[PDB]
Amino acid sequence: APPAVTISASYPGADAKTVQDTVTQVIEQNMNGIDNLMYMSSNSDSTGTVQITLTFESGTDADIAQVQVQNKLQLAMPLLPQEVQQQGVSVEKSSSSFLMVVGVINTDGTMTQEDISDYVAANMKDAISRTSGVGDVQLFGSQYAMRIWMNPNELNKFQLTPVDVITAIKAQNAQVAAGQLGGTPPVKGQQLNASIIAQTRLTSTEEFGKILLKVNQDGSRVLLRDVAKIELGGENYDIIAEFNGQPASGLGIKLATGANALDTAAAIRAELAKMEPFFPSGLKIVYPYDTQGVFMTMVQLPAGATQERTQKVLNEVTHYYLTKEKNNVESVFAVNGFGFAGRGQNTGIAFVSLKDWADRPGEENKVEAITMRATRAFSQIKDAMVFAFNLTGFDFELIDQAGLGHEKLTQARNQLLAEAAKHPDMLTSVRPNGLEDTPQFKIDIDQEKAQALGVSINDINTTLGAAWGGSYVNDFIDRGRVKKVYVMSEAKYRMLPDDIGDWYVRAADGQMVPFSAFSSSRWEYGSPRLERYNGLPSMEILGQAAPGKSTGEAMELMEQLASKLPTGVGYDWTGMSY
Amino acid sequence: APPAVTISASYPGADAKTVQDTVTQVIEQNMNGIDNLMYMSSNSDSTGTVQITLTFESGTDADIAQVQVQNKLQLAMPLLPQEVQQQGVSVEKSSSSFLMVVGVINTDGTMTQEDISDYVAANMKDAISRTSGVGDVQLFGSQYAMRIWMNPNELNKFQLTPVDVITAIKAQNAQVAAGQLGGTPPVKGQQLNASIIAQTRLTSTEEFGKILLKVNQDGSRVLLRDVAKIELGGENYDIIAEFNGQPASGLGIKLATGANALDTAAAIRAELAKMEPFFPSGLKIVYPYDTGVFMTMVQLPAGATQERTQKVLNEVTHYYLTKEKNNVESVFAVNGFGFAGRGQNTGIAFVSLKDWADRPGEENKVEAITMRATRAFSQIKDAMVFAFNLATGFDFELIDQAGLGHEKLTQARNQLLAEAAKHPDMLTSVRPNGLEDTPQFKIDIDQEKAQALGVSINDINTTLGAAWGGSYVNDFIDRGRVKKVYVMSEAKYRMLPDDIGDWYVRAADGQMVPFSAFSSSRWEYGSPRLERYNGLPSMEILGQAAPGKSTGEAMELMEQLASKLPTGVGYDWTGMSY
Amino acid sequence: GSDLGKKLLEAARAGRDDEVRILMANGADVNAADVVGWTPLHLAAYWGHLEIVEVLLKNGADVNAYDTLGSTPLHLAAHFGHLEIVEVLLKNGADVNAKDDNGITPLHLAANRGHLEIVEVLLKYGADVNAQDKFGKTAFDISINNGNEDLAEILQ
Ligand SMILES: COCCN1CCN(c2nc(SCCc3ccc(OC)c(OC)c3)c(C#N)c3c2COC(C)(C)C3)CC1
């Protein structure tokens, strides 16, 4: 297979364009001078995530490819936003499919899904990630951070903002290098040498809750807990898993390019065996997907679908396997928020493990027939693509060659898809691989009104972003382990458009100014996932030859339709069609 | 021996916990996706140093291991404190040992070790690095830094703090781009083009002395020399080295992979011969180790100072140079490191024997020498002093598997050690490899008082850190060579707890506030050296099989004792016992 | 005093009950002090070695020895939640209202760590509930600041 190296980065609270124009384009522009690169593709998403895939000529040494990529990325790192740099950028040389899933459940229902995920993140994932052959490890859930859930009513009552909160956290959750008594070079006759210990990271919600934000003129104290709820909770809330319908987390493990499948899996089990004796009570490992006695089901809903609606679809999938197929299926491990493609609120995946072969006699109880029957049962689910598969027609990129921009490229894409649909004798299921534009809330900050009021634009933008998007402030120590601190609005003050107006910013003169005084807003459409191909804006189109036609005939026709598109729109073949 | 790679970082003025929790953990958490890793071990210490050692399977290519580690570290660089990034975080192959150790001494009594180290850095080290067959070259000491040694009494006199000093150095020891007259794009027909040269880095103590801190309201100037003594000195003062009692620097030189030992040694000696003509007076090269060197370790009690250690090392040198004058050519005494730790209460002497041919009879061989030496030093009071020549023993790690914390892991360790003591039939000399907790000075800043007085936390913490720990401010140019500038208190104002109260910080309203107004302190115990194993808190335990027991039996007993420890304590075997 | 002194400080530190009895019998200064002014009684109180505490007190250890920052063995026992040591020290005459150099009392320290059984014994032995440290703060302020309603109960 051509080896591929993946760069991943994140920007908390960023929309797709923001990610693309501050991160993705910057990396791409700097991926020069790397040997044997066949092509590069990227997605920039409204989850705040970018993935850049660099695919190398067959025969390329994946180690050299990875090192060359990492080194260019290193020279580009100072060009990226500080918020992106501080999340950690990763570079992996991995297969894109899973080798295995390590599930973790709590048999005594002592621990919620969130607890279990933190336990895995904080106690298991690093040692697995260091096991030789392990290319990529996905946590099905999130590590805890310290979560400061801000209340805008209480902030405004005390004439405070998220900026004051972030400032206080950085000042009061600090790890200070303070020197030594009797330090070198010392005076003659010194008797005592001892470290000076000053501020140290906080370790608990109790300690965060008593951060001192201010002292009122009257002498009363405003503590962080007087304007926020303080709790441990995920760095993010996007991925939730279940094992046979019960709360779970786990690790999805991808094989390092060129490593040995069987050796790596055994190294993994051996590492798990070291951890088990120290689990808290109730906690237990399950094995829901070991790579013909397994398969996957993909769930892909339209952009716009929420966590609740993806979950309803996954509940249908899971139910089918635990009822209609309960004689063949041993388990289902289902993940809401991550799928084939990676991360989104509109996607899911179910890993299905079958009973022993010898106990599924009959060709109707073998994987091929089970997957076919499942796809057929799920083919009627509304506004979802749901199918079961183990783990070919064409792979086309439409390309913006002339700075046309997203809206025009979408119109060209639609023109091509309409033309393709008039040739059903030659092309079947010609479709975009990506996502459709969805409504977004465009808010305009009035620079004039802000200046007239003495309200700083940086205080406005921090207030907006930190409250509605979240902001990674600094690190703390949870039960001995370095983890993140995040500030964000408590959920109920960031749900609806009118909530924008309840957030106040402090002017230079000390007055509190509501957001409504200096902003206006409207609905518009934009992209939840912007694609690029060899550094240019792109839209991936999949399809296949119609029955009784060669792939090459299907491709020749696509090329002909492509030659009639608006000026500045090109194309290229990738993946299986390269 | 399995190949190993060591990551080394420095955080000047940082305690062990500060280093561990802002640097070590962050690095360890990023050590994934690295092939062939058998285990990872780290130490974080009170001299602000971390060493992380990654040990690879036998037959791993050490260059490939090194590059994979370095890339993962480099991608985590923005996660580390600035102060650490500015010191450089090195990644080197560490399983190699030395071709040769060159000492550079001065015999006239005219140069300090810092003077000799600067000479070596500026005039010798790079020519030796380019010598045929030479790999890594380690400098013993540093090039000069410009040392600004602050006086808190003079600072407070003029209502200044170290913050003002640091600001003034950045502003007045600066070198910035100022553009051109007549540069492109010009007015057409322009004839004049000339670079604009504005401030240039400072080059001398005199120039640093004239930096203008402020002009008083009566028009008198306060110059940096009115609040500080200014001299060229070392970048740090942790280590004092002597060669036969004379100040010393030198070079530790490794053989490039594939080169010849004998030709490389000869090429080094010939290169040093060329430099001899240019040496200043008294400078001499010595060769304490070149491919019968033994060691004497020195360990003083908790909190013992560099000066007390020096007295012991000086008795050790004197002994060898009088009582073993027929057998000993040199003693290279290093104060501030030993094996098992850095720190003011540790030291080691490297003793180079005269030729075999000049030491007739068994009484003059290494073994008789070291036994007499140990016998004689067993008198020395308030130090442990031991002479030694480098399938017996075992190397065990006790591991915190469940967030127990340092105090609990130490209690578990002590339980295991008390049990191992009860089986002298089977186990002998079961002991910690590391250091015990020692007194430390805990200073708590009072946030309410700081806020009531208008004193900023950042001013407080910079004033404390910069005075007592030192701070690398920026670079200057010494005789054409870029070098570091450090601020730190003059030694006499940073020695004892009472000196804390001589440091003032300036409030927003301009009043000077002593430290004692907003802080309190107490004595407590804590670690001067924290250890981690495979990413978890750890304590290494050494030991051996008793008279005619196998190591296998001894290990089995340790395993069985280890199984009775408190919940959440695990173990592993490492090094020779892996 | 002695080299036995240093040995007694080390033995009390590391909890070595027997070696403490021996060094005692050989005339080790019971009130020997290390460089930060900690006596064997400080060291046994901090590290929770109850029996060493008792043995040292029977041998005339000064119950109110103060370190170079004004802290007494009771401060350390109270801060580190060693209840039985707190009782023993108070029975041997420990000053229940001793203030360190910062004006901090054993009640302030137990209160800040939420060591309620200790708070109770301190109050039983006459701890001044209104004693202020250098910043004006009482054990009650400490309870309000830390959000410990159980401790706020007890101290009214
Ligand atoms: C960062 O320090 C760790 C390096 N260790 C291995 C090399 N080593 C060694 N040092 C010496 S001589 C002392 C060198 C020295 C002088 C000043 C210093 O001050 C800055 C200093 O610190 C680096 C070291 C010798 C010999 N002979 C050997 C080793 C090594 O062992 C031999 C047997 C080869 C002879 C010193 C310790």
GROMACS .gro file of C-alpha atoms and ligand atoms in nm, chain B residues 51 97-103 113 117 138-142 236 238-243 248-252 254 287-291 293-295 330 332-335 337-339 342 348-352 390, ligand 1:
model
   88
  629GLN     CA    1   1.717   1.332   3.271
  675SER     CA    2   3.125   0.600   2.714
  676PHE     CA    3   3.435   0.809   2.676
  677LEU     CA    4   3.733   0.779   2.456
  678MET     CA    5   3.912   1.037   2.671
  679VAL     CA    6   3.882   1.303   2.941
  680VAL     CA    7   4.104   1.605   2.895
  681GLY     CA    8   4.163   1.829   3.195
  691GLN     CA    9   3.745   2.752   3.696
  695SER     CA   10   3.598   2.706   3.116
  716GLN     CA   11   3.109   1.760   2.653
  717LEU     CA   12   3.240   2.082   2.809
  718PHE     CA   13   3.312   2.073   3.186
  719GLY     CA   14   3.170   2.412   3.284
  720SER     CA   15   3.039   2.687   3.052
  814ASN     CA   16   2.591   2.821   3.692
  816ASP     CA   17   2.656   2.407   4.097
  817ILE     CA   18   2.985   2.228   4.033
  818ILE     CA   19   3.336   2.299   4.169
  819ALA     CA   20   3.614   2.093   4.003
  820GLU     CA   21   3.974   2.062   4.103
  821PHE     CA   22   4.264   1.866   3.957
  826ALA     CA   23   3.998   2.292   3.642
  827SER     CA   24   3.779   2.259   3.334
  828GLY     CA   25   3.809   2.012   3.047
  829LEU     CA   26   3.641   1.806   2.777
  830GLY     CA   27   3.480   1.463   2.779
  832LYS     CA   28   3.345   1.036   2.264
  865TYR     CA   29   4.500   1.348   3.054
  866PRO     CA   30   4.333   1.167   3.345
  867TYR     CA   31   4.164   0.904   3.126
  868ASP     CA   32   4.268   0.790   2.777
  869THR     CA   33   4.185   0.459   2.596
  871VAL     CA   34   4.108   0.515   3.704
  872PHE     CA   35   3.903   0.447   4.011
  873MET     CA   36   3.654   0.653   4.201
  908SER     CA   37   4.605   1.261   3.994
  910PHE     CA   38   4.003   1.508   3.975
  911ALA     CA   39   3.762   1.611   4.252
  912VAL     CA   40   3.411   1.711   4.147
  913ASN     CA   41   3.184   1.874   4.403
  915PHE     CA   42   2.762   1.553   4.155
  916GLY     CA   43   2.803   1.188   4.253
  917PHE     CA   44   2.628   0.887   4.112
  920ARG     CA   45   2.343   1.604   4.191
  926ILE     CA   46   3.308   1.228   4.347
  927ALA     CA   47   3.677   1.200   4.291
  928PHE     CA   48   3.829   1.042   3.985
  929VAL     CA   49   4.168   0.896   4.080
  930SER     CA   50   4.415   0.817   3.803
  968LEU     CA   51   3.399   0.006   3.872
 1313LIG     C1   52   2.726   1.572   3.345
 1313LIG     O1   53   2.814   1.487   3.423
 1313LIG     C2   54   2.800   1.346   3.404
 1313LIG     C3   55   2.922   1.298   3.326
 1313LIG     N1   56   2.986   1.188   3.400
 1313LIG     C4   57   3.067   1.102   3.315
 1313LIG     C5   58   3.200   1.171   3.279
 1313LIG     N2   59   3.276   1.202   3.401
 1313LIG     C6   60   3.410   1.158   3.420
 1313LIG     N3   61   3.495   1.254   3.462
 1313LIG     C7   62   3.628   1.234   3.482
 1313LIG     S1   63   3.721   1.365   3.537
 1313LIG     C8   64   3.612   1.487   3.610
 1313LIG     C9   65   3.551   1.565   3.497
 1313LIG    C10   66   3.468   1.688   3.531
 1313LIG    C11   67   3.525   1.812   3.560
 1313LIG    C12   68   3.442   1.925   3.584
 1313LIG    C13   69   3.304   1.918   3.573
 1313LIG     O2   70   3.229   2.032   3.597
 1313LIG    C14   71   3.130   2.093   3.514
 1313LIG    C15   72   3.249   1.796   3.543
 1313LIG     O3   73   3.115   1.784   3.529
 1313LIG    C16   74   3.059   1.737   3.405
 1313LIG    C17   75   3.330   1.682   3.518
 1313LIG    C18   76   3.685   1.112   3.456
 1313LIG    C19   77   3.814   1.099   3.472
 1313LIG     N4   78   3.929   1.074   3.478
 1313LIG    C20   79   3.603   1.009   3.407
 1313LIG    C21   80   3.465   1.032   3.391
 1313LIG    C22   81   3.379   0.918   3.342
 1313LIG     O4   82   3.433   0.798   3.389
 1313LIG    C23   83   3.563   0.765   3.341
 1313LIG    C24   84   3.598   0.632   3.404
 1313LIG    C25   85   3.559   0.745   3.189
 1313LIG    C26   86   3.664   0.873   3.379
 1313LIG    C27   87   3.206   1.299   3.482
 1313LIG    C28   88   3.068   1.237   3.513
   0.00000   0.00000   0.00000
